[PDB]
């Protein structure tokens, strides 16, 4: 609402209230083609997301928790003293590309590319996902993961050469038998536009996610509440 840096003001202004979100994913995992649509709202003031996702092609062929990181970090809450480090909002409204490779230990990998940008007043995240080399009897295609999600801190670093950011981090998915399925993420983000962006000092994001079901919904779906806060600069 009041920042002495006009570049920060420009990005904050687009995220000042509740912003509607649309998520589209087209996926192919070991030749099972599927699509997911999601709708909800983001409130960057509190770092809060609320989304509901539907598999529009029938039953989702992989477990919903494996898609949480893939299915909008511009809604992170950056403390006032860290707002000059917020790459994600500084790239708006033209947006950014978010690319990942996700390696599931002892199993296959996801390769994702997403464009995150405004269409009018709506923040859209449009994703293509390709998954290969998964085991039919593994934890992913065998749906052995529990329907829950662990809190996680992720380290963000600038990539000055690409005018973007980079991160590598591990997600632990609980398996029904009490064990864990590791998912190693590599991520890079680059701006879509050619204007300047804020390139951050090293810092981390703290995330927490809660998964639930809509008791009146017959389609395969996931309801997601996420909180993300930046930290690590004193």
52 in Cβ contact with 222 (< 8 Å): yes
What does the chain look like in DSSP terms, one character per residue? Answer: ---S-HHHHHHHHHTSSEEEEEEEEEEEETTEEEEEEEEEEEETTTTEEEEEEEETTSS-SS-GGGGTTT--GGG-B--GGGGGG-HHHHTTTT-EEEEEEEEETTS-EEEEEEEEEEETTEEEEEEEEEEES--TTSTTTTT-B-S----EEEEEEEEGGGTEEEEEEEEEEEBTTS-EEEEEEEEEEEESSSS--PPPPSEEEEEEEEEE--TT--SSEEEEEEEEEEE---
From residue 24, how far is each of 27, 105, 125, 183, 231 by CA, in Å? 10, 27, 6, 22, 29
6-231 belongs to which CATH class? Answer: mainly beta
Other residues' Cβ atoms within 10 Å of the Cβ of residue 147? 14
Could you give the CA distance from residue 35 to residue 178 in angstroms, rounded to a whole number? 30
Classify burial at 224, counting beta carbons within 10 Å of its beta carbon; exposed 0-12, middle 13-18, buried 19 or more: buried
12 in Cβ contact with 1 (< 8 Å): yes
- 164-174 vs 48-55, strand pairing mode: unpaired
Other residues' Cβ atoms within 10 Å of the Cβ of residue 187? 19
Cα 49 versus chain centre, distance: 11
Q: Which of 65, 54, 46 is nearest to 22 (CA)?
A: 54
Q: Could you tell me the resolution of this structure in angstroms?
A: 1.6
Residue at token pair 């829950």: 148
Q: Where are the domains of the chain?
A: 6-231
């Amino acid at each position: 609402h009041h920042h002495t840096d006009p570049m920060v003001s420009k990005g904050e202004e687009l995220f000042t209230g509740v912003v509607p979100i649309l998520v589209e994913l087209d996926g192919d995992v070991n030749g099972h083609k599927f699509s997911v649509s999601g709708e909800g709202e983001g409130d960057a003031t509190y770092g809060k997301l609320t989304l509901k996702f539907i598999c529009t092609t029938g039953k989702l062929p992989v477990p919903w928790p494996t898609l949480v990181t893939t299915l909008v970090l511009c809604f992170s809450r950056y403390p006032d003293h860290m707002k000059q480090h917020d790459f994600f909002k500084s790239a708006m409204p033209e947006g950014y590309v978010q690319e990942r490779t996700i390696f599931f230990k002892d199993d296959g990998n996801y390769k994702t590319r997403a464009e995150v940008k405004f269409e009018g007043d709506t923040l859209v995240n449009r994703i293509e996902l390709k998954g290969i080399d998964f085991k039919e009897d593994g934890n992913i295609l065998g749906h052995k993961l529990e329907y829950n999600y662990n809190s996680h801190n992720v380290y963000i670093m600038a990539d000055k050469q690409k005018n973007g950011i980079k991160s590598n981090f591990k997600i632990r998915h609980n398996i029904e038998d009490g064990s864990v399925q590791l998912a190693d993420h590599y991520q890079q983000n680059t701006p879509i536009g050619d204007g300047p962006v804020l390139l951050p000092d090293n810092h981390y994001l703290s995330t927490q996610s809660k998964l639930s079901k809509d008791p009146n919904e017959k389609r395969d779906h996931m309801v997601l509440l996420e909180f993300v806060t930046a930290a690590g600069i004193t």
